[PDB]
PDB file of C-alpha atoms in Angstrom:
ATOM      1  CA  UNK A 282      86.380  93.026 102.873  1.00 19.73           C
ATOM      2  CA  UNK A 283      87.163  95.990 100.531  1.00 20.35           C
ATOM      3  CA  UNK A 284      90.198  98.498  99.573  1.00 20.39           C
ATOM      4  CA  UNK A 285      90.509  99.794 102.764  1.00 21.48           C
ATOM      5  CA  UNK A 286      90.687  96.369 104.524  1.00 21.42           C
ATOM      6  CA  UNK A 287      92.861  95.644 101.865  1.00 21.53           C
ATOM      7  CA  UNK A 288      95.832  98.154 102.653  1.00 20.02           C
ATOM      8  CA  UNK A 289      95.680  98.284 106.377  1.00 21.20           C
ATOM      9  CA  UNK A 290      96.432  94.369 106.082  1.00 20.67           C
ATOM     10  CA  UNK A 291      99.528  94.822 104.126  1.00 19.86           C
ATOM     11  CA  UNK A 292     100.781  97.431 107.173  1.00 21.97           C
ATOM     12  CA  UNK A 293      99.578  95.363 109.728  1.00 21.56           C
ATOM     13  CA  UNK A 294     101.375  91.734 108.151  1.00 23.22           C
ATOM     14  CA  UNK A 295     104.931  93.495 107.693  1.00 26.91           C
ATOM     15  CA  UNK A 296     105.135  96.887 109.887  1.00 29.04           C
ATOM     16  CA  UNK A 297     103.511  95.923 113.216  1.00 30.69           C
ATOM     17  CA  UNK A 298     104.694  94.427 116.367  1.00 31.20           C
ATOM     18  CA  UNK A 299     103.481  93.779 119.697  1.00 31.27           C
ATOM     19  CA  UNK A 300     105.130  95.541 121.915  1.00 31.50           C
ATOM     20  CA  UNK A 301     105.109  95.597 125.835  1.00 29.59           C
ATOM     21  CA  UNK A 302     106.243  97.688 128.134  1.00 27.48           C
ATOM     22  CA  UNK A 303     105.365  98.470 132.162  1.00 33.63           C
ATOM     23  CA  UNK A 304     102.200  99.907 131.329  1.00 32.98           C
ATOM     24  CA  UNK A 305     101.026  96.917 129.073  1.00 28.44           C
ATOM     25  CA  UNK A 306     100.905  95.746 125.717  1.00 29.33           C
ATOM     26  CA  UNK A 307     100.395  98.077 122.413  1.00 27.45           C
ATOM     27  CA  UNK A 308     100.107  98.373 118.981  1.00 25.67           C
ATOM     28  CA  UNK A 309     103.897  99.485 117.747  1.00 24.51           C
ATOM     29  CA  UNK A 310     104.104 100.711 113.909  1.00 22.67           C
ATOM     30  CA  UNK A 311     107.452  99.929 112.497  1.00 22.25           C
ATOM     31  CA  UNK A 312     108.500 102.829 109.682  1.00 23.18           C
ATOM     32  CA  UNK A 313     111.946 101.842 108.272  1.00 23.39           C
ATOM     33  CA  UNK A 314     115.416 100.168 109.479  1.00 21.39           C
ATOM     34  CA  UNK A 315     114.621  99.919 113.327  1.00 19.79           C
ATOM     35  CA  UNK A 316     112.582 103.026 113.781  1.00 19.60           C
ATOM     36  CA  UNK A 317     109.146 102.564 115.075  1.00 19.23           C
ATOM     37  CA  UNK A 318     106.527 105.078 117.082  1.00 20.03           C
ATOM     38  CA  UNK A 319     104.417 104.337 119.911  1.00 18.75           C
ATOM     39  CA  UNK A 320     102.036 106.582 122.263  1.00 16.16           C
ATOM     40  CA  UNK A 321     104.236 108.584 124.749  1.00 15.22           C
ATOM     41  CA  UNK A 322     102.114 107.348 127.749  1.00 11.49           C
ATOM     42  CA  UNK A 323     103.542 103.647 126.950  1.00 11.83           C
ATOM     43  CA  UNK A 324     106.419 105.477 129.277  1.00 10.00           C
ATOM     44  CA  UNK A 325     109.273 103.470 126.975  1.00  9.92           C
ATOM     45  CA  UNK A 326     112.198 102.699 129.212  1.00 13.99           C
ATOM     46  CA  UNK A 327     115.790 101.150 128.454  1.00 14.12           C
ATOM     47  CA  UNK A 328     114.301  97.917 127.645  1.00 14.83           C
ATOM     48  CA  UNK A 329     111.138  96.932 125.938  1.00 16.06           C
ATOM     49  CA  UNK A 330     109.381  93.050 124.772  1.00 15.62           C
ATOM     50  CA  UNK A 331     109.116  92.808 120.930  1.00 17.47           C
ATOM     51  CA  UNK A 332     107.062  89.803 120.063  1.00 14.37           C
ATOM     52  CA  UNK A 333     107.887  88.710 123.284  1.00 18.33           C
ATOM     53  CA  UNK A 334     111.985  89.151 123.120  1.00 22.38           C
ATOM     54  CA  UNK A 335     114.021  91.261 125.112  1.00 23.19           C
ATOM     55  CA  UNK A 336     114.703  93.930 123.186  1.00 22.00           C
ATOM     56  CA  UNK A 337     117.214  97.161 123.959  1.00 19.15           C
ATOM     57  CA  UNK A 338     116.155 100.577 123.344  1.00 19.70           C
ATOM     58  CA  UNK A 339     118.908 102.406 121.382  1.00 18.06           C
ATOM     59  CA  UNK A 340     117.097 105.931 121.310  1.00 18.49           C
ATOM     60  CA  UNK A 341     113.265 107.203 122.621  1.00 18.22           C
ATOM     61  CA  UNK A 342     112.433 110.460 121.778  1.00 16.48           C
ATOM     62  CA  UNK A 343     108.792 111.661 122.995  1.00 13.73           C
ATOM     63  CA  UNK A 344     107.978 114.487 120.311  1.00 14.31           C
ATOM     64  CA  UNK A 345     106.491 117.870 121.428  1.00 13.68           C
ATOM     65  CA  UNK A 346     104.997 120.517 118.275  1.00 11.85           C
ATOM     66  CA  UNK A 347     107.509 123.921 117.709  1.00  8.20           C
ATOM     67  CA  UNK A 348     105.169 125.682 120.081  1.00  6.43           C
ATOM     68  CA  UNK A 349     106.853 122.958 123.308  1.00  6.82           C
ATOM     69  CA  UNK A 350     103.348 120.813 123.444  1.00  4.40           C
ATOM     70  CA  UNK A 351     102.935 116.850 123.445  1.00  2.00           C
ATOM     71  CA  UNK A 352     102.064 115.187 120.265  1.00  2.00           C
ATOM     72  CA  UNK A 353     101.873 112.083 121.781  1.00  3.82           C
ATOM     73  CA  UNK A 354     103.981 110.059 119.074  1.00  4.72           C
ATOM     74  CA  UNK A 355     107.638 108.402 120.723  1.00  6.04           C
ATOM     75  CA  UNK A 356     110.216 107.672 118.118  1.00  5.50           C
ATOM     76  CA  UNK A 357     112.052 104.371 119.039  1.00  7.90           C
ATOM     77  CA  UNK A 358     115.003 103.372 117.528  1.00  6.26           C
ATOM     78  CA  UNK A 359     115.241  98.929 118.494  1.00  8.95           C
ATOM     79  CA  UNK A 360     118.360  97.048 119.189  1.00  6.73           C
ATOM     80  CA  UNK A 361     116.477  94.422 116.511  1.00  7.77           C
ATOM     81  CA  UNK A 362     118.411  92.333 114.381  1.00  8.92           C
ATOM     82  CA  UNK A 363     115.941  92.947 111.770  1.00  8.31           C
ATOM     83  CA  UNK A 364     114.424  96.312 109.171  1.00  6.65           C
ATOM     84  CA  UNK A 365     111.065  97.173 108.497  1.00  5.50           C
ATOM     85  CA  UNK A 366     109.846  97.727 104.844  1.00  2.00           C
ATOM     86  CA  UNK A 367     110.726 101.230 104.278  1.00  2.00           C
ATOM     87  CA  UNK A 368     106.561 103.216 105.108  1.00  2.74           C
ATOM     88  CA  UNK A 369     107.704 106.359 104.616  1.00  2.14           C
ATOM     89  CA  UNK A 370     106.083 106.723 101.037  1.00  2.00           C
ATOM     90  CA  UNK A 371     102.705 106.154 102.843  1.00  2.00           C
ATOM     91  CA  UNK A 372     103.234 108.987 105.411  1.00  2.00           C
ATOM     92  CA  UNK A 373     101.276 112.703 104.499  1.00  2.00           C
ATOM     93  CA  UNK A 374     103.007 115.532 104.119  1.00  2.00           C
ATOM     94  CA  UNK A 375     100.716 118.099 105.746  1.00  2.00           C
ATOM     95  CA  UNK A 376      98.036 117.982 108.405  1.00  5.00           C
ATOM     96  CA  UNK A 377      94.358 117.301 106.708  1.00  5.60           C
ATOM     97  CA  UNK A 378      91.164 115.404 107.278  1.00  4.84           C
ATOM     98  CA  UNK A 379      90.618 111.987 105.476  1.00  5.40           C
ATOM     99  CA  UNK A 380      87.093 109.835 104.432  1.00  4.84           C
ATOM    100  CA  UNK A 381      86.976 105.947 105.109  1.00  3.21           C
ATOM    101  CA  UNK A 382      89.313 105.069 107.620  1.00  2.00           C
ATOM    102  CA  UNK A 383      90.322 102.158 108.967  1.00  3.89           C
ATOM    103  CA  UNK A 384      92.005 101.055 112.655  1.00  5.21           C
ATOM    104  CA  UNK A 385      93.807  97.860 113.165  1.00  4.81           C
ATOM    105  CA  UNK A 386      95.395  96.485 116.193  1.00  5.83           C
ATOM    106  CA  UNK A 387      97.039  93.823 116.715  1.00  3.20           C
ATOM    107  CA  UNK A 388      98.109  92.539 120.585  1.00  2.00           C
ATOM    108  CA  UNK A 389      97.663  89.050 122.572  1.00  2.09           C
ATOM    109  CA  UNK A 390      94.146  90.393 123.875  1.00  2.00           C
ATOM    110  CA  UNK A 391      93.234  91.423 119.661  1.00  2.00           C
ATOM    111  CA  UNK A 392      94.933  89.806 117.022  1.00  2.00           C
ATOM    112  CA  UNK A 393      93.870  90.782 113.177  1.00  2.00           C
ATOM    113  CA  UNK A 394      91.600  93.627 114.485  1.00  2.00           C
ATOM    114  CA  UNK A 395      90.546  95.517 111.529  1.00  2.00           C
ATOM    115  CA  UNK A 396      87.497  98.779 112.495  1.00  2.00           C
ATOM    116  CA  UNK A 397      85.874 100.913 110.109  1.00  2.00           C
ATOM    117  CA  UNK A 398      85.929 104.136 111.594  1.00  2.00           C
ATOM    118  CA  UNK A 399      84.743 106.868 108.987  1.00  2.00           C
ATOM    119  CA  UNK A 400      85.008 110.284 108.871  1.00  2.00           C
ATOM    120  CA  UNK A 401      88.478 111.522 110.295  1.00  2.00           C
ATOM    121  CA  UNK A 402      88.535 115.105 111.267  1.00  2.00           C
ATOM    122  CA  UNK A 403      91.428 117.434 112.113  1.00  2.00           C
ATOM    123  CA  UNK A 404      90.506 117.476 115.340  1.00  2.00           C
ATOM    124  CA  UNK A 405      93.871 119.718 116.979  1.00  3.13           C
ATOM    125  CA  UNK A 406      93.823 120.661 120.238  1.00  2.59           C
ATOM    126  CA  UNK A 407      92.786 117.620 122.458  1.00  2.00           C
ATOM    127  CA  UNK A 408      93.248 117.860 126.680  1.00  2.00           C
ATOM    128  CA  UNK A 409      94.303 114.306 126.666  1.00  2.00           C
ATOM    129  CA  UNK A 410      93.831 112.331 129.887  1.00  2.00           C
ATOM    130  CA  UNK A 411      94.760 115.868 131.533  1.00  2.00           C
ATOM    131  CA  UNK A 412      97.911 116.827 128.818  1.00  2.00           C
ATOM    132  CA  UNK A 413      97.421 119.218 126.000  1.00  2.00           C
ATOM    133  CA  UNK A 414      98.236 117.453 122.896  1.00  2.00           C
ATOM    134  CA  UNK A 415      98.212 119.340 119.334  1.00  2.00           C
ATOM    135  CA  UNK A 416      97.590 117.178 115.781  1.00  2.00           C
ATOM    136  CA  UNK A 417      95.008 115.114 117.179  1.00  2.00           C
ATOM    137  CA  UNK A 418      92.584 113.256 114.440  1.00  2.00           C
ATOM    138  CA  UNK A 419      89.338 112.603 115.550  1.00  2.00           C
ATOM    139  CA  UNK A 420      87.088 109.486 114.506  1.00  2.72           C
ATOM    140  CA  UNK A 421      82.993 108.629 115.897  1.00  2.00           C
ATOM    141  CA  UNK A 422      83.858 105.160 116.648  1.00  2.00           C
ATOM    142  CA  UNK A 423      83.429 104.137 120.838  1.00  2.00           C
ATOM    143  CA  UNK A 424      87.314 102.826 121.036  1.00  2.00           C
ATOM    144  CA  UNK A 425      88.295 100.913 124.109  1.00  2.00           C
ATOM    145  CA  UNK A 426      91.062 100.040 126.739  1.00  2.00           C
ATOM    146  CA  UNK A 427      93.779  97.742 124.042  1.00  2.00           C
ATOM    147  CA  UNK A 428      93.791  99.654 120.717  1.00  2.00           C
ATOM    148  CA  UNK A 429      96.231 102.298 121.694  1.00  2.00           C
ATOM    149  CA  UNK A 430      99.339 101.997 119.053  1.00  2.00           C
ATOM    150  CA  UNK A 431      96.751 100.824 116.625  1.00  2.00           C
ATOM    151  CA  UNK A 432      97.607 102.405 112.816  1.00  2.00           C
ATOM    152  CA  UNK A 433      94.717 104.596 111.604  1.00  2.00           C
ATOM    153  CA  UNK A 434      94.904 104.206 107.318  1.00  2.00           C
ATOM    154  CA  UNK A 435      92.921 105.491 104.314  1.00  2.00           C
ATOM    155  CA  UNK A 436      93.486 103.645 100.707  1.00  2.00           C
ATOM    156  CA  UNK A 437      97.300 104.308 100.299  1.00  2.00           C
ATOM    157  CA  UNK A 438      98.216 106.254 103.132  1.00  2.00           C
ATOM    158  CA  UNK A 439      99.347 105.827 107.088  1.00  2.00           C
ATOM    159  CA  UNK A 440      98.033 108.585 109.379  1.00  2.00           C
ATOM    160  CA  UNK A 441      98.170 108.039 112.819  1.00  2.00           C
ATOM    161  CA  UNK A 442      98.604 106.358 115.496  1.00  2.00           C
ATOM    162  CA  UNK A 443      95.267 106.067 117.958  1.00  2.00           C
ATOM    163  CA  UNK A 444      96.063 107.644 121.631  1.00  2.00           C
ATOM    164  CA  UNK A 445      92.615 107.947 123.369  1.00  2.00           C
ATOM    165  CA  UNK A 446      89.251 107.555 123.706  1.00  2.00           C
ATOM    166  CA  UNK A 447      85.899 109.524 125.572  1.00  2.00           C
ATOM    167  CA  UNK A 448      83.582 105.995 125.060  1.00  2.00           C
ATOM    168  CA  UNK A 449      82.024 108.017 121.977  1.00  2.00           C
ATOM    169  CA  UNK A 450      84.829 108.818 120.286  1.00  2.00           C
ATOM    170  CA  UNK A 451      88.477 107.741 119.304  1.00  2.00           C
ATOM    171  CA  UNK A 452      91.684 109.924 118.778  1.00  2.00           C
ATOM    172  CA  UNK A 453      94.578 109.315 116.814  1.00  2.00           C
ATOM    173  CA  UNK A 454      98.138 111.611 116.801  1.00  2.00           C
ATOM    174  CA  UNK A 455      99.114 112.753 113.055  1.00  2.00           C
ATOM    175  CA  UNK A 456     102.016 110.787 111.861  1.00  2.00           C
ATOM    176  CA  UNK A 457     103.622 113.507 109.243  1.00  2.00           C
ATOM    177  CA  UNK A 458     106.619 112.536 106.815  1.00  2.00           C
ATOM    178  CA  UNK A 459     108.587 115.343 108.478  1.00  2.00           C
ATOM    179  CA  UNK A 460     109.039 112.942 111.522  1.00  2.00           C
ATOM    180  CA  UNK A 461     111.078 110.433 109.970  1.00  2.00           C
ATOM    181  CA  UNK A 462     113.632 112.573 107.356  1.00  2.01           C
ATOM    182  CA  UNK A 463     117.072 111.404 107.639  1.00  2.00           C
TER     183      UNK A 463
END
């Protein structure tokens, strides 16, 4: 409907897939080549559905912050016979707090799911779901069960990746350039 609409569709139409694993379908951000991210708790195995293929997993890695603590994020590397546009570009340098956010999901249960979520705070230290987790952005928008994976944006950048809820508000895990050098 607006700028901010605007840029979280052109992620969503050519760096998203659906992807499923044992613990159900999410959200999957696709960064360049065949690297994408996912929440750690999707518990990414050997094998994983893409759009509803068998796909094999050629590398996880569940990343944890200098200090040994979650951050929630999983680097996958896909046996797919196909690259993503090359994000990086999009991807902040440093940890911050952002105005006018938007989240946008995209699974069999929510297709084209766009939510304007507001305010983002650097939220940091979040016990999530009983595991402390570091670079967590905060939003005031009542998330639910099916948006984890989905990409929090601003107007020209990619942020995070949404993790958890408490029925008030929603929590994303910082996705930093840093993650994806090569």
């Amino acid at each position: 409907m607006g700028p901010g609409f605007d840029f979280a569709q052109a992620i969503m139409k050519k760096n998203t897939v659906i992807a499923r694993t044992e613990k159900g379908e999410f959200t999957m951000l696709g960064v360049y080549d065949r690297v994408a991210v996912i929440p750690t708790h999707a518990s990414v195995g050997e094998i994983i559905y893409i759009n509803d293929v068998e796909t094999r997993v050629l590398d996880a890695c569940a990343l944890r912050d200098l200090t040994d603590t979650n951050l929630e994020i999983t680097i996958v590397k896909l046996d797919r016979n196909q690259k993503f546009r090359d994000i990086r570009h999009f991807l902040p340098r440093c940890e911050d707090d952002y105005n006018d956010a938007v989240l946008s999901v995209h699974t069999s249960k929510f297709p084209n799911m766009y939510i304007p979520v507001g305010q983002v705070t650097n939220y940091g230290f979040l016990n999530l779901g009983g595991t402390p987790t570091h670079r967590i952005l905060m939003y005031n928008f009542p998330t639910r069960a099916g948006q984890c994976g989905g990409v929090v944006t601003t107007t020209g950048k990619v942020i995070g990746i949404h993790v958890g809820g408490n029925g008030a508000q929603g929590f994303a895990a910082m996705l930093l350039h840093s993650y994806f050098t090569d």
